[PDB]
Enzyme design. Structure first.
Site, PDB file in Angstrom:
ATOM      1  N   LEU A   7       1.508   4.866   1.119  1.00  0.00           N
ATOM      2  CA  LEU A   7       1.078   5.847   2.119  1.00  0.00           C
ATOM      3  C   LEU A   7       1.905   7.133   1.960  1.00  0.00           C
ATOM      4  O   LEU A   7       3.076   7.185   2.338  1.00  0.00           O
ATOM      5  CB  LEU A   7       1.205   5.264   3.541  1.00  0.00           C
ATOM      6  CG  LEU A   7       0.280   4.047   3.780  1.00  0.00           C
ATOM      7  CD1 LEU A   7       0.677   3.203   4.998  1.00  0.00           C
ATOM      8  CD2 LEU A   7      -1.179   4.485   3.885  1.00  0.00           C
ATOM      9  N   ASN A  45       7.494   4.635  12.765  1.00  0.00           N
ATOM     10  CA  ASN A  45       6.828   3.462  12.180  1.00  0.00           C
ATOM     11  C   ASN A  45       5.323   3.655  11.995  1.00  0.00           C
ATOM     12  O   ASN A  45       4.580   2.713  11.695  1.00  0.00           O
ATOM     13  CB  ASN A  45       7.093   2.230  13.047  1.00  0.00           C
ATOM     14  CG  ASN A  45       8.499   1.694  12.864  1.00  0.00           C
ATOM     15  OD1 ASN A  45       9.148   1.985  11.861  1.00  0.00           O
ATOM     16  ND2 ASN A  45       8.972   0.902  13.821  1.00  0.00           N
ATOM     17  N   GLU A  87       0.823  -1.201   0.000  1.00  0.00           N
ATOM     18  CA  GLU A  87       0.000   0.000   0.000  1.00  0.00           C
ATOM     19  C   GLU A  87       0.869   1.269   0.000  1.00  0.00           C
ATOM     20  O   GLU A  87       1.742   1.405   0.847  1.00  0.00           O
ATOM     21  CB  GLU A  87      -0.900  -0.019   1.241  1.00  0.00           C
ATOM     22  CG  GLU A  87      -1.933   1.069   1.317  1.00  0.00           C
ATOM     23  CD  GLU A  87      -2.735   0.988   2.615  1.00  0.00           C
ATOM     24  OE1 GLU A  87      -2.531   0.033   3.395  1.00  0.00           O
ATOM     25  OE2 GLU A  87      -3.557   1.877   2.865  1.00  0.00           O
ATOM     26  N   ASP A 126       7.768  -2.978  17.795  1.00  0.00           N
ATOM     27  CA  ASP A 126       8.594  -1.813  17.476  1.00  0.00           C
ATOM     28  C   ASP A 126       7.727  -0.565  17.230  1.00  0.00           C
ATOM     29  O   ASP A 126       7.903   0.168  16.257  1.00  0.00           O
ATOM     30  CB  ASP A 126       9.504  -2.124  16.272  1.00  0.00           C
ATOM     31  CG  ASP A 126      10.677  -1.164  16.156  1.00  0.00           C
ATOM     32  OD1 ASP A 126      11.114  -0.621  17.203  1.00  0.00           O
ATOM     33  OD2 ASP A 126      11.149  -0.939  15.011  1.00  0.00           O
TER      34      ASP A 126
HETATM   35  C1  LIG Z   1      11.693   0.554   4.934  1.00  0.00           C
HETATM   36  O1  LIG Z   1      10.299   0.076   4.863  1.00  0.00           O
HETATM   37  C2  LIG Z   1       9.295   1.103   4.719  1.00  0.00           C
HETATM   38  C3  LIG Z   1       8.134   0.606   4.329  1.00  0.00           C
HETATM   39  O2  LIG Z   1       7.890  -0.621   4.470  1.00  0.00           O
HETATM   40  N1  LIG Z   1       6.940   1.523   3.643  1.00  0.00           N
HETATM   41  C4  LIG Z   1       5.595   0.980   3.081  1.00  0.00           C
HETATM   42  C5  LIG Z   1       4.927   2.116   2.547  1.00  0.00           C
HETATM   43  N2  LIG Z   1       3.935   2.454   2.018  1.00  0.00           N
HETATM   44  N3  LIG Z   1       4.030   3.763   1.785  1.00  0.00           N
HETATM   45  C6  LIG Z   1       5.246   4.362   2.223  1.00  0.00           C
HETATM   46  N4  LIG Z   1       5.486   5.578   2.095  1.00  0.00           N
HETATM   47  C7  LIG Z   1       6.491   6.305   2.585  1.00  0.00           C
HETATM   48  O3  LIG Z   1       7.384   5.776   3.285  1.00  0.00           O
HETATM   49  C8  LIG Z   1       6.666   7.689   2.393  1.00  0.00           C
HETATM   50  C9  LIG Z   1       7.328   8.473   3.369  1.00  0.00           C
HETATM   51  C10 LIG Z   1       7.511   9.853   3.183  1.00  0.00           C
HETATM   52  C11 LIG Z   1       7.033  10.506   2.000  1.00  0.00           C
HETATM   53  N5  LIG Z   1       7.189  11.862   1.783  1.00  0.00           N
HETATM   54  C12 LIG Z   1       7.215  12.824   2.863  1.00  0.00           C
HETATM   55  C13 LIG Z   1       5.810  13.532   2.992  1.00  0.00           C
HETATM   56  N6  LIG Z   1       5.309  14.049   1.661  1.00  0.00           N
HETATM   57  C14 LIG Z   1       3.922  14.658   1.746  1.00  0.00           C
HETATM   58  C15 LIG Z   1       5.362  13.000   0.602  1.00  0.00           C
HETATM   59  C16 LIG Z   1       6.803  12.420   0.494  1.00  0.00           C
HETATM   60  C17 LIG Z   1       6.377   9.715   1.035  1.00  0.00           C
HETATM   61  C18 LIG Z   1       6.190   8.329   1.222  1.00  0.00           C
HETATM   62  C19 LIG Z   1       5.876   3.422   2.706  1.00  0.00           C
HETATM   63  C20 LIG Z   1       7.066   3.040   3.325  1.00  0.00           C
HETATM   64  C21 LIG Z   1       9.156   1.928   5.919  1.00  0.00           C
HETATM   65  C22 LIG Z   1       9.483   3.232   5.928  1.00  0.00           C
HETATM   66  C23 LIG Z   1       9.325   4.010   7.105  1.00  0.00           C
HETATM   67  C24 LIG Z   1       8.821   3.424   8.289  1.00  0.00           C
HETATM   68  C25 LIG Z   1       8.491   2.084   8.290  1.00  0.00           C
HETATM   69  C26 LIG Z   1       8.636   1.338   7.154  1.00  0.00           C
END
Ligand SMILES: CO[C@@H](C(=O)N1Cc2[nH]nc(NC(=O)c3ccc(N4CCN(C)CC4)cc3)c2C1)c1ccccc1
Ligand SMILES: [Cl-]
EC number: 2.7.11.1
Length: 281
Positions: free
Chosen positions: A85, A132, A83, A127
């Site tokens: 997010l 997260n 998904e 965690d």
């Molecule tokens: C390393 O695995 C991932 C993971 O599995 N995931 C699954 C999953 N689904 N969607 C994700 N999106 C983002 O991490 C993300 C973060 C910041 C983002 N920006 C900052 C705000 N802006 C408005 C848009 C651009 C845009 C997208 C993730 C990460 C993970 C990452 C962080 C925490 C936990 C897990």
């Protein structure tokens, strides 16, 4: 089939030494997805965590837990389709400045729903922390990083494993005695502090010290300009004795949550704030 046929990456949104995460597209439907790619050649030790996350997420079906859509193998790369997010993590959303107690209560409420779902499925996140907690652009709040999540069964009654992030870990997890879902409730109480102040207690200390401080001291308290009910929310979570900690379901009806939480869609202004903040600088 071939994931480089089925999927198209639009943008790299995360990077580590073993892996990368992208915003991308399922080409068949044009659906936006998250694409986490693991270099299996470089992955070594953490490959067991990758496996554990995939296993747990494949068993989850909740609007409060990041969806898993499948895994693909291409040469040395593992493609994990999830998904998308796009709001950022709760920690990310702290960067431009402090949350108000309405935002905090709303975020905690949604985390609680996610924990309630998992605990009823006899899963333990282990965690829980702001980093997260991932938001959608609509302001939905969902749990992610299931690398060390644990499963309760009948063959094994509780968990023992020393696992998590030290500043957020429950004392009974540090001691490696028999623990359960109540460990997540401690971590949630630490996350509540983190949401209020920007950092967990002892965040300037070496992790090793925190492993003896947490069992040695009385539970941390939330200090400063925070409403009494928020401080009592923290206080209820961070009980040394797990059988005195509330469940996530109970916490859904804590007065701090009831008097302060609002519709999740109001969190979009918190995401707008981050967009504007990000763009500048
Ligand atoms: C390393 O695995 C991932 C993971 O599995 N995931 C699954 C999953 N689904 N969607 C994700 N999106 C983002 O991490 C993300 C973060 C910041 C983002 N920006 C900052 C705000 N802006 C408005 C848009 C651009 C845009 C997208 C993730 C990460 C993970 C990452 C962080 C925490 C936990 C897990
Ligand atoms: Cl990563």
């Amino acid at each position: 089939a071939d994931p480089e046929e089925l999927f198209t990456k639009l943008e790299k949104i995360g990077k580590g030494s073993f892996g990368e995460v992208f915003k991308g597209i399922d080409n068949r439907t044009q659906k936006v997805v998250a694409i986490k790619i693991i270099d299996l050649e470089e992955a070594e030790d953490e490959i067991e965590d990758i496996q554990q996350e995939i296993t747990v997420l494949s068993q989850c079906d909740s609007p409060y837990v990041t969806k898993y859509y499948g895994s693909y193998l291409k040469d040395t790369k593992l493609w994990i389709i999830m998904e998308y997010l796009g709001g950022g993590s709760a920690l990310d959303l702290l960067e431009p400045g402090p949350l108000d107690e309405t935002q905090i209560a709303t975020i905690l409420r949604e985390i609680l729903k996610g924990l309630d779902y998992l605990h009823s499925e006899k899963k333990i996140h282990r965690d829980i922390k702001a980093a997260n907690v991932l938001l959608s652009e609509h302001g939905e709040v969902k749990l992610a990083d299931f690398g060390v999540a644990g499963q309760l069964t009948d063959t094994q009654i509780k968990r023992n494993t020393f696992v998590g992030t030290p500043f957020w870990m429950a004392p009974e997890v540090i001691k490696q005695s028999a623990y359960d879902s109540k460990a997540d409730i401690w971590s949630l109480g630490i996350t509540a502090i983190e949401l209020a102040r920007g950092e967990p207690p002892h965040s300037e200390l070496h992790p090793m010290k925190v492993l003896f401080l947490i069992p040695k001291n009385n539970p941390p308290t939330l200090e400063g300009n925070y409403s009494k009910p928020l401080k009592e929310f923290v206080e209820a979570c961070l009980n040394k004795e797990p059988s005195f900690r509330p469940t996530a379901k109970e916490l859904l009806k804590h007065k701090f949550i009831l008097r302060n939480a609002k519709k999740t869609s109001y969190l979009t202004e918190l995401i707008d704030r981050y967009k504007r903040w990000k763009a500048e600088q």
